Write a protein that binds this ligand. Sequence first.
Ligand SMILES: *[C@@H]1O[C@H](CO)[C@@H](O)[C@H](O)[C@H]1NC(C)=O
Ligand SMILES: *[C@@H]1O[C@H](CO)[C@@H](O)[C@H](O)[C@H]1NC(C)=O
Ligand SMILES: *[C@@H]1O[C@H](CO)[C@@H](O)[C@H](O)[C@H]1NC(C)=O
Ligand SMILES: *[C@@H]1O[C@H](CO)[C@@H](O)[C@H](O)[C@H]1NC(C)=O
Ligand SMILES: *[C@@H]1O[C@H](CO)[C@@H](O)[C@H](O)[C@H]1NC(C)=O
Ligand SMILES: [N+]
Ligand SMILES: [N+]
Lengths: 207, 207, 206, 207, 206
Amino acid sequence: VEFDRADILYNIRQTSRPDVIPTQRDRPVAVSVSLKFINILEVNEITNEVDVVFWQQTTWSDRTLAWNSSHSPDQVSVPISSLWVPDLAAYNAISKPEVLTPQLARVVSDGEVLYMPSIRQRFSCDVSGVDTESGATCRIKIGSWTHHSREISVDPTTENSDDSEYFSQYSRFEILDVTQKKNSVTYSCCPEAYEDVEVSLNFRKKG
Amino acid sequence: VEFDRADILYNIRQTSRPDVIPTQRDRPVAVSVSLKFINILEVNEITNEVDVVFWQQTTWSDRTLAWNSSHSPDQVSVPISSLWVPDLAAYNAISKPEVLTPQLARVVSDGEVLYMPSIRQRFSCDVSGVDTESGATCRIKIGSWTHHSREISVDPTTENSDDSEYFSQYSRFEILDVTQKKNSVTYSCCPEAYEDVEVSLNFRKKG
Amino acid sequence: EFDRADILYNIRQTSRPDVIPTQRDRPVAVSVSLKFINILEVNEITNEVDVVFWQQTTWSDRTLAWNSSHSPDQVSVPISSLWVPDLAAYNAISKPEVLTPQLARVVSDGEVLYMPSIRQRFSCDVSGVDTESGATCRIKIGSWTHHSREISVDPTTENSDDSEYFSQYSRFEILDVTQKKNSVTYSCCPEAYEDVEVSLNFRKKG
Amino acid sequence: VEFDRADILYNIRQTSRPDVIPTQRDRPVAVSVSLKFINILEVNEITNEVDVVFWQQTTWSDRTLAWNSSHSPDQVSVPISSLWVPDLAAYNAISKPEVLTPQLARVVSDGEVLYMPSIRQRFSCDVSGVDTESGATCRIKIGSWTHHSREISVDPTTENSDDSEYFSQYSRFEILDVTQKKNSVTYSCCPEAYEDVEVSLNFRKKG
Amino acid sequence: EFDRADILYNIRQTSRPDVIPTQRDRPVAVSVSLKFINILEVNEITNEVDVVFWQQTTWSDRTLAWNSSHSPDQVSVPISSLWVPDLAAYNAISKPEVLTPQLARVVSDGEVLYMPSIRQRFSCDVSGVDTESGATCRIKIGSWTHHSREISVDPTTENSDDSEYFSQYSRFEILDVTQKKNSVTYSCCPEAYEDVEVSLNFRKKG
Ligand SMILES: *[C@@H]1O[C@H](CO)[C@@H](O)[C@H](O)[C@H]1NC(C)=O
Ligand SMILES: *[C@@H]1O[C@H](CO)[C@@H](O)[C@H](O)[C@H]1NC(C)=O
Ligand SMILES: *[C@@H]1O[C@H](CO)[C@@H](O)[C@H](O)[C@H]1NC(C)=O
Ligand SMILES: *[C@@H]1O[C@H](CO)[C@@H](O)[C@H](O)[C@H]1NC(C)=O
Ligand SMILES: *[C@@H]1O[C@H](CO)[C@@H](O)[C@H](O)[C@H]1NC(C)=O
Ligand SMILES: [N+]
Ligand SMILES: [N+]
């Protein structure tokens, strides 16, 4: 054992610059974002508002975190306060994200970071048809609040898992389909393009 | 690269004095304030209260932040906790501003600062006529809480985009017009003048 | 001589926020004035009000003073860098929700002005709220832990309209705001605690 | 003046160890606990829940705080963050204590500490009979969460003042009697005894 | 030899709260036991419960140990000075509201006993709550970020009654509480994560 977990964590806390985006060769930090829906708690077809629980699965690389793990543990759990974390925000959120879980990320000796908080949050989106067979399709847009496409690129995750694997069987609602579209948007507010992942939650009230 | 992003951020955090208004020449800090409405969530015509979501687009100059970017990135995102930010408050707010987004501002190498939080907040204003064709006109006044007109001037941005560019299509309400104008008010409390931007939100319930 | 950065640096390095600025063993004179902005919710059954007010607080702290003959004579300072009086409303039934930036204004002679906008609920007399005479809700504000030899609490000068800053859009209207200074000795402690009692006479609009 | 208030507070701030229980001679710290009821805000006889405002009058001795006051002030107010405070909890509380008042205690030059926060808190207790002449009797148990009887002893106080001395005349309810009594309980979780003060609030809806 | 001041000073100076106390590359054995205190609100339509429980948590951290042959063998330490397991209820729909002082008990051999009283809301099976058989609500608690080689989670051996500490004033009553140990592999992740599944069998009182 070259570096034990105490040495690894000590090195990360002393030298991780949480305010510094881990950019490489002036390429954007590639952030992967995938929502795994856990619950749909409250739906209002009149106001077009949903209250939803989801895992915001977030991965990226930060090579300033890397260590030689040939004779050491190759992974540690790190408080996010000690790490740079992408400034992701859901564009159509109408409440502050309530993080339900310990605020720790997993860091791998090659600098990959995985962070997957469970968030409860309310959204403004299309709720029409929720009580039909076709269901409603609520779209959630997540992207960097302040980093444009040359600094943060945002891409949807890789595909092997079912959409309902994590979803509560006790919810009043059921998931029909979940698709993760990718957008690069240039707005009037700002000259640069901002990338987002658009998650389409097709869901319906159980019969 | 002369200064990479780590160097820029290091220099800012070591020398930015967040308590210190960046007044130059004994001229006021010119603060630009523009509200971009995102949603109108709840309206009560009996109590004259609205619950609204808006981007509080705030720009100002802080020369102590400037760096030589001839061979360096000319922009970085910085936690507002490392910067002086204007002490702006909505005068007719009846709840604490709920900041929905990451608390980062964008700083340009010439010292210009761009801070645009998405805020949910409740306001006491005129809701009468909300369910008519003319609609209601809700006025929100935003100014510095403690800096008078010789220290902070407050001005509405030049208005280029439509008032609904970022407004939710799923809101029960629609925006008819938004106008911004500045005031300089002497109050009886204090002998100086305090500047504000008055935002008039003309809106109505959809038919 | 001193720019704002120097003044704020000096204050931040030498202001002792835990230390009451008593001088000659006289009480710190704290002026308290409530300016009502809104009355949000009223319940005549439970005798509870929800209100928005500016808690205008002034006092002197000479350890803050600087020579301003060739310098700015005022700066805004985070209250975290300043001693602030431990004032509490005796009949509050919620924590004070401070709506505004936590900054005070400090003048070069050491006079501090702190005026947070606060939303807070109170237990008080709501009876008669829907009559012409209105209800009279009394709010008592005093130092939680400093007795009259350490903090004296005085109502400021009433100079303006009592509805000067009151919302025209409130369901309610203000008939009169009066501010008075009581001097009480309670069964807890052989010494005296000062408070300002604010009487808010208000009614539902017709 | 030998030590002014600045010197006293400086000395306390520098040497008070707020994480260290002030045992002497391996005797328990004697903590006095007395509730003074200010208001009864909400009562539910169906759920057996009450919402109450009370002063939690707490006194104890901490000799590491003492100073020579022969020529100095014999009392100061001190942020509780600079003092050790007893880890008291109400056993049947169903909400976190909402502390309404500034978080300062009073310290006397002999090391006697008095801390009296005004607390709003909800309780699970017997609400039956609330709307009868006999009234309801709601019992609240307060003791140390983690210190057993050899480390903290908890005792009530003396009935100098009436039970409704500070109780709101504007409450929907009235206090008939308060009794505060000492308990020492050995539970099954833990081989030690934990002391508590059990406050019995006899109260009724006004007629 | 060491008074409580010395013990706490040594812990505060050397306890590394971000460092998991793995030994010989064996997992930290974390014991988890829920003691239900109250069931506050139940909704059979939404399948949601609001519950108060003691989250009794124990583990060993030998970097906390001290020689207690002539010293106190136990102290209470703020959790902020200790490593605590990153436990999370998988079906919680609200943040855990910790009702109690955030202190743990540390024994001189390095055993930590942390038992917060927690109010939390859960999504689980509420059907049958108003029948004699009652509802069975299952709550799963495991480490959020540590797999089975780093943290093992096990139900504690508990002689004490299910209702030992449950409120007699609750609208509900407890019929049975079982605890059960799982280990799962999810698609997201190569490794296995351990949890304790607590089955709360409960019903509305008649
Ligand atoms: C990693 O460390 C080991 C020494 O334990 C060494 O064998 C190897 O060279 C290192 N790999 C590098 C430097 O990439
Ligand atoms: C910026 O730096 C360059 C060298 O990188 C220098 O030539 C130029 O004078 C600098 N700008 C200033 C100090 O105005
Ligand atoms: C303030 O500074 C001025 C100018 O330097 C000086 O005349 C005066 O002595 C100072 N005030 C005092 C302490 O008398
Ligand atoms: C307290 O201080 C006075 C002198 O200021 C001294 O006479 C007395 O001895 C001191 N108390 C003791 C015994 O520590
Ligand atoms: C604890 O101290 C005692 C003597 O006070 C000693 O016998 C022993 O070496 C110490 N710790 C161990 C290794 O058990
Ligand atoms: N999980
Ligand atoms: N995870």
